[PDB]
């Protein structure tokens, strides 16, 4: 029996950076080589386990998070790296074990005129804890009592759309990305083939 990989990598529409799609994948004879028939795999690097010798090892619980980011921000999904998407809307721990897979996809995501469908939290108060997802879309403060639902000194909504178009440089193109979280210590082999 196989498990959901061709239902995590062939999704029609991916979620936004601040709305990643958490999932669990267990009870399956898991073959990590269905990946290689997918794409050129622009970004593929594994921490804690080698990709070549992956198909044999077994894991406790494997989580998968899928979303879409810009071109020059794929580097920010790494343990301990600070930025604007890592420090504001998606942060993974320093002891992370698993790996990340990002493949440029702008044949299905950029429209002529700007696809205002993917957003990302630009403003917040402080950093977030690992794997902490929030959806609140209140109007950001303005230091003093803000211009709640109005304009003024500093009343800036927190979400901002990416707006992909087919004239953007390769640095501004959309990139789909999936993050796999493993467990390896004393594991009761439940997902492996």
């Amino acid at each position: 029996n196989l498990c959901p990989f061709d239902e995590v990598f062939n999704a029609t529409r991916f979620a936004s950076v601040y709305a990643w799609n958490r999932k669990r994948i267990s009870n399956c004879v898991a073959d990590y080589s269905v990946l290689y028939n997918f794409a050129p795999f622009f970004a593929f690097k594994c921490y804690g386990v080698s990709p070549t010798k992956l198909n044999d090892l077994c894991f406790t619980n494997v989580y998968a998070d899928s979303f879409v980011i810009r071109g020059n921000e794929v580097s920010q999904i790494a343990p301990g790296q600070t930025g604007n998407i890592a420090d504001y809307n998606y942060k993974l721990p320093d002891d992370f074990t698993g790996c990340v897979i990002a493949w440029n996809s702008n044949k299905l995501d950029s429209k002529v005129g700007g696809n205002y469908n993917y957003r990302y939290r630009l403003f917040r108060k402080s950093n977030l804890k690992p794997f902490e997802r929030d959806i609140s879309t209140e109007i950001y403060q303005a230091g003093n009592k803000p211009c709640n639902g109005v304009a003024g000194v500093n009343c800036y909504f927190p979400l901002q759309s990416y707006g992909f178009r087919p004239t953007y440089g390769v640095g501004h193109q959309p990139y789909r990305v999936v993050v796999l979280s493993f467990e390896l210590l004393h594991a009761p082999a439940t997902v492996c083939g």
Partner: antibody, heavy 118, light 108 residues
Framework: ITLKESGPTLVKPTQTLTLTCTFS??????????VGWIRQPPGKALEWLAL???????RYSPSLESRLTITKDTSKNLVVLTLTNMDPVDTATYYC???????????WGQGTLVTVSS | SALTQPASVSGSPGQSITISCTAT?????????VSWYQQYPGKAPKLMIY???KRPSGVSNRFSGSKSGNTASLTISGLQAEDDAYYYC?????????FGGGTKLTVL
């Protein structure tokens, strides 16, 4: 893949012109697929008009927007373009081609010549 | 104004010829997708090449594009009498797709 346009061949000044482009071989459900319209005056260059994506996100040409409302019906696979206020400038050929992101307008239809005058 | 194409070209039959589609406009973006169309004497344009140096399977192996920066050099090798036709270039700008002014190719 195949497309075919149809509609009124003749129209009078300051009138609402309508055209229906029926396609076969593909649908408007798969990703990337979209449908746009183009016109060409006699002996002049082609031009863009509008576009309807597969996500029901619609786009028009900047100069000539606020008109030519492009609608669609995915059950019988038909797209409809309607542009009002006919002028003698609008007398030209019209084509409905399918757009992918890189291969822009790779599948064109036949095209129907339409006249705008008394 | 949006793109720019020469008036016409006439190459002797059996030779090569290049055509230029300069943008002549700032901020056309990255100028990465530039498609070329074959216009017959009163027929629907046919896609010849897309994605600069790329080409859709179904056409000959003589057409080849290039980019000297801001333009698209459409090339035609082994010119045959069948190639007498109109040619156009096409590439989105920030707001909307634009076309070229047209080019005429008559073989003599």
């Amino acid at each position: 893949i195949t497309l075919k346009e149809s509609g009124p061949t003749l129209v009078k000044p300051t009138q609402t012109l309508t055209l229906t482009c029926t396609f076969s071989g593909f649908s408007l459900s798969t990703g990337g697929v979209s449908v746009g319209w183009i016109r060409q005056p006699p002996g002049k260059a082609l031009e863009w008009l509008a576009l309807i994506y597969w996500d029901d996100d619609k786009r028009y040409s900047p100069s000539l927007e606020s008109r030519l409302t492009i609608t669609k019906d995915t059950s019988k696979n038909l797209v409809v373009l309607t542009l009002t206020n006919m002028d003698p400038v609008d007398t030209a050929t019209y084509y409905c081609a399918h757009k992918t992101i890189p291969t822009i307008f790779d599948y064109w239809g036949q095209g129907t010549l339409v006249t705008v005058s008394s | 104004s949006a793109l720019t194409q020469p008036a016409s070209v006439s190459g002797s039959p059996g030779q090569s010829i290049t055509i230029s589609c300069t943008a002549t406009s700032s901020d056309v973006g990255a100028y990465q997708y530039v498609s070329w169309y074959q216009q017959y004497p009163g027929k629907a344009p046919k896609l010849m090449i897309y994605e600069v140096s790329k080409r859709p399977s179904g056409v000959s192996n003589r057409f080849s594009g290039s980019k000297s920066g801001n333009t698209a050099s459409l090339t035609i090798s082994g010119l045959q009498a069948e190639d007498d036709a109109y040619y156009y270039c096409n590439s989105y700008t920030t707001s909307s797709v634009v076309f070229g002014g047209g080019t005429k190719l008559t073989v003599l």
